[PDB]
Design a protein around this ligand. Structure first.
Ligand SMILES: [Cl-]
Ligand SMILES: [Cl-]
Ligand SMILES: [Cl-]
Ligand SMILES: [Cl-]
Ligand code: NA
Ligand code: NA
Ligand code: NA
Ligand code: NA
Ligand code: NA
Ligand code: NA
Ligand code: NA
Ligand code: NA
Ligand code: NA
Ligand code: NA
Ligand code: NA
Ligand code: NA
Lengths: 172, 172, 172, 172
């Protein structure tokens, strides 16, 4: 094992590889969400932009995890990336619900890795997750909750008009 | 025939003259659409601007075809320009449907000329159409499809209010 | 099928989805190559940068194909992404050989799609591939051939020293 | 004891004094390494600069620990500083191996203090170490591992030439 590796368990090394797979799967789900909203029969440019930006954020998350794996002397192992759960994502409301479920799953994977690091007494891992992931995930989930509330308030009223207004006046 | 003319069939020369007529007819249709939306009893400035800009694009298309006709040593022949199909264009939805039908007809005329150029082994014509027309037409048809979807989503909800919002928040 | 779709075969639509999968698989292979070269026991920063930049290029290729799919009124369909062919990539020479084999496979997939577009008389597809893919692929394969020649000239001489010099004086 | 001291154990206070001694000992070792590489019969300016910069980093580490000791109301106690382990440091490879062993020892002292802070429920200490020391130490050890790999690849090939090239083309 590495000349540099110190206090870095095989359990954390494997969990980090699994977390990379989860973040790349999430990036791929957001790519599908973004292009769905660019369809000529869906055509919500602000929604497409919101999800394409999240695809980039999740890929950057995966890349940060891979850099950290190499800095600790672990070995990156890539697995197949499962396709997204849907081919078509319904309304803006349906899509934002699917996104908040996906973010909560990433959050729970972060909290599980944090607990593993704590059990393995790995403060560099705990610091890394706290610094680069946990606060960003909480902020993103809160933003998605705010969006869900605003979408629901609008499409209860008058569904097509409310989806247009949310895209025009909240998203860009 | 020209001192410059080389590999330029009489079939392509005639089809180019017909395509100029189609583009000028389209420019004239967009002029009528634009001024309809400027009527005091229609009054959708963003819609008028959208169609007036397309009138200019179609005239520029015709002018590019005429320049190319002279560059190849063909002879421009102008015919009567038929008036537009309607005097009044209904709602924004009606108008955008009429526009996408007109763009699909220009697209099919481009594809027909491309096929003629291919049959006549005229790669300069094929390159000209690919470079200046085919991609612009696909992009425009996609934009009109996106508009149709957004208009339909809005005027299903509440017709007059939805037409106002589309003009204010999408068009300018 | 789409309000916008015109002259866009189901055969091309499916081949475009397959080509997106190939480009995303290639992006993933380049991500693995890049992080392999960042390992503390490999440590060739210029090589890691070369492959990470190609990971971004291949993802941008996939995104361009998806935009084009929507512009033509086709429907993006995502499949599972197969993991890369290796977990460890050997020397710079081994890696550059694996990269040129992967680029030739993408090139052959582009040429196959071009031939399908030609058989289906789809000049917009032929133009799209010629404009955004075919010349970039030829230029990249030539650059990789130049690299392979320089690496082979260096590591024939004195393997570790030659790999260091190539990374320091050609790559960045 | 201090008017300001709160939740700051005598065990942590003593361990912080010991850690200051370790960091100043490391600074002194890097001073000796730097001046060894400036000898007219060694003469590797980039290597001398690398170690002199680390001498400054380790002294800054000690100074940060002393500031923190006073901020918590502990009392700085200075002990004799042991001379470095060698008077002459051999090749660049020998020196970089000695440096990575010294950094791993500082890292293990940081992890031991983190574990003590955790046992004493001292989150300010845990935060201080995570913020200013743990990530810097991991990044430095990874950089030294990368250097060791590159030096070994070069001096396996042709020892004197490889040491020159590493100094000229990696270090400055
Ligand atoms: Cl372990
Ligand atoms: Cl002829
Ligand atoms: Cl078909
Ligand atoms: Cl105490
Ligand atoms: Na370890
Ligand atoms: Na769980
Ligand atoms: Na937002
Ligand atoms: Na001719
Ligand atoms: Na026809
Ligand atoms: Na527009
Ligand atoms: Na079609
Ligand atoms: Na083939
Ligand atoms: Na290059
Ligand atoms: Na205390
Ligand atoms: Na210990
Ligand atoms: Na350095």
């Amino acid at each position: 094992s590495s000349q540099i590796r110190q206090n870095y368990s095989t359990e954390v090394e494997a969990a980090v590889n699994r977390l990379v797979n989860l973040y790349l799967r999430a990036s791929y789900t957001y790519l599908s969400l973004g292009f769905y909203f660019d369809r000529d029969d869906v055509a919500l440019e602000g929604v497409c932009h919101f999800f394409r930006e999240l695809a980039e954020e999740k890929r950057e998350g995966a890349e940060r995890l891979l850099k950290m794996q190499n800095q600790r002397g672990g070995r990156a192992l890539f697995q197949d990336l499962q396709k997204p759960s849907q081919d078509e994502w319904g309304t803006t409301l349906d899509a934002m619900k699917a996104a908040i479920v996906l973010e909560k799953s990433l959050n729970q994977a972060l909290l599980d890795l944090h607990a593993l690091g704590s059990a393995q007494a790995d403060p560099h891992l705990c610091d890394f997750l706290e610094s680069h992931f946990l606060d960003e995930e909480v902020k993103l989930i809160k933003k998605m909750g705010d969006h869900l509330t605003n979408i629901q308030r609008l499409v209860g009223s008058q569904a097509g008009l409310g989806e247009y207004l949310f895209e025009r006046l909240t998203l860009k």
